[PDB]
Amino acid sequence: QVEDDIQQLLKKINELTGIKESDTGLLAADKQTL
Amino acid sequence: LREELQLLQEQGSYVGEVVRAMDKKKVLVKVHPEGKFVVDVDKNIDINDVTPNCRVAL
Amino acid sequence: LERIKDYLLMEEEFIRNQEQKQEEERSKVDDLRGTPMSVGTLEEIIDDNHAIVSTSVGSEHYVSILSFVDKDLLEPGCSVLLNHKVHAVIGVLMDDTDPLVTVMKVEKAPQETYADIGGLDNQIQEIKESVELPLTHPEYYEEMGIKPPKGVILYGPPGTGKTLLAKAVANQTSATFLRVVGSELIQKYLGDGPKLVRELFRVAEEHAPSIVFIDEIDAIGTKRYDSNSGGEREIQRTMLELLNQLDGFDSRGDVKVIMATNRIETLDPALIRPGRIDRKIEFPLPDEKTKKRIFQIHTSRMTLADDVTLDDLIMAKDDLSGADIKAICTEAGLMALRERRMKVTNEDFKKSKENVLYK
Amino acid sequence: LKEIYENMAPGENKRFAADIISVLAMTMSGERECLKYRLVGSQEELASWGHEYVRHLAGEVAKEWVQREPLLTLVKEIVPYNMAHNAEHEACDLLMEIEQVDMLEKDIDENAYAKVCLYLTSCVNYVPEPENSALLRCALGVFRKFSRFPEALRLALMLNDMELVEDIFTSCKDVVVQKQMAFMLGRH
């Protein structure tokens, strides 16, 4: 579980992380080409 | 009342044969001569009140 | 303790998951399309995010996808989202609930149970082990470098319990159960014995691991239905089809195969051979013990006069199978319901025996 | 018999009295004196099956439970209640809190193996207020299936560390078993 414990929190980091810059930056590959 | 009779000119209405509704909001339908179109509904109806196999003014 | 830290971890994951400019971009993606669009069918394709489509009215336009969703998500000859302008591919679609998967795809429980088939066993362990086993506990074969019993065949007189087995397994099974009859494998339209087989097998391969079951595979031969064509040079292919689909090239995968025939003398050896159908199981017609379990099982779930002795019935018929016994069980029911009597009597079974068996 | 009970910091000896008088208080129908012995049950019923006593009175303090031997010893029925189970994880976390350099040396010097001590490890050094080793020298000792090879290498991996480099050294005695341990010690 300790290893498993490290597993969960580690994954939660990205989960927590990913949301961050997500807020920041807020089509063209196609919408242009479209 | 007889003045808006020009309304008849506005256009026509397409009956249609609903293939079935879905997600994203837009009824999937095959009209009649042509074929299948997935198209939005009237605001005055649900998506849920819309079943399969039934006529509706498009 | 860390369990709590583990739980909230699982919870925080749920939040970020649910946690899924853009609105405009999404609207841009809505705006890009048209309200309303146009259905149309795939034909060819090109790395130019465009190919020629196919229409009922049969305009075939060259058109791009509106690209976030994908061309490789789809195959040629498939209905796609098209504008009404150029019929521009606006995206993929979902092959709507066809009328094949439904029919061929028994969802609800099959009833019965592997402790409902009185008088069986080795027949049971043979099937289960060969099929049900490698499906549940499949961890042994992974060490003995063996695989599973490819297909299995069930045969014997009419009432040996072949359909029970197909019914028993499905009762505690966990894989899509495709119930296709061969008799249905005989339509009245040339070159249609090879579509049905492909659709059933194609449907089976899609739903991933599943049980294709063919009860009465014999009916594909031991029968020449009026409305047909070719007479028998057509059924043959349909066999050939079955034989080929149930067999070689590609790589079938997890399609297990269950055939239910009474007479195994009218099966093409190509279907019996192993590879195609390995385990060959027989269903003997009770005797004096199995019947007891069959009788006890069928009369044990009802107000069966504790007076009479299932024995009398067992030693009654000459070689009655596991059906006839059931008919007698039921006969009394109607007898019972007839003279309005919660519990049945002797004659009730007698009339039944003489009412069903004899007649 | 309340007098011999006055000194309640024992690792063990306070146990049986705190089981008997408390069960003597439990069959007696009481929730007062019973708990006072539950804090001070460092074994109440460990081997013997616990009454309504342990479940209630442990956990009542268990959630209340730097450190109070009352709290500390109450759970020394509990962590062993979890050790009698040999499985797994709960009052270790109770222990990780405890910052007692006796218990962590003192608790499981014996008993468990496989997976079992493997997750005792990450608790040993890392989790408590301090860092700990002893079990990983101590319960480590017996390490039957290779003292220690089996579990410690499951420990030598993971914690992308190297402290477990001796652990393999200690067990891995073959040059070539150690050649793998050598690389294993090398790979850190």
Ligand SMILES: Nc1ncnc2c1ncn2[C@@H]1O[C@H](COP(=O)(O)OP(=O)(O)O)[C@@H](O)[C@H]1O
């Ligand atoms: N020994 C038995 N145990 C349980 N059911 C039986 C037994 N014998 C007959 N039956 C019932 O009678 C029916 C006979 O079907 P089946 O065994 O498939 O015969 P056939 O293969 O000729 O169609 C089954 O549905 C089953 O429920």
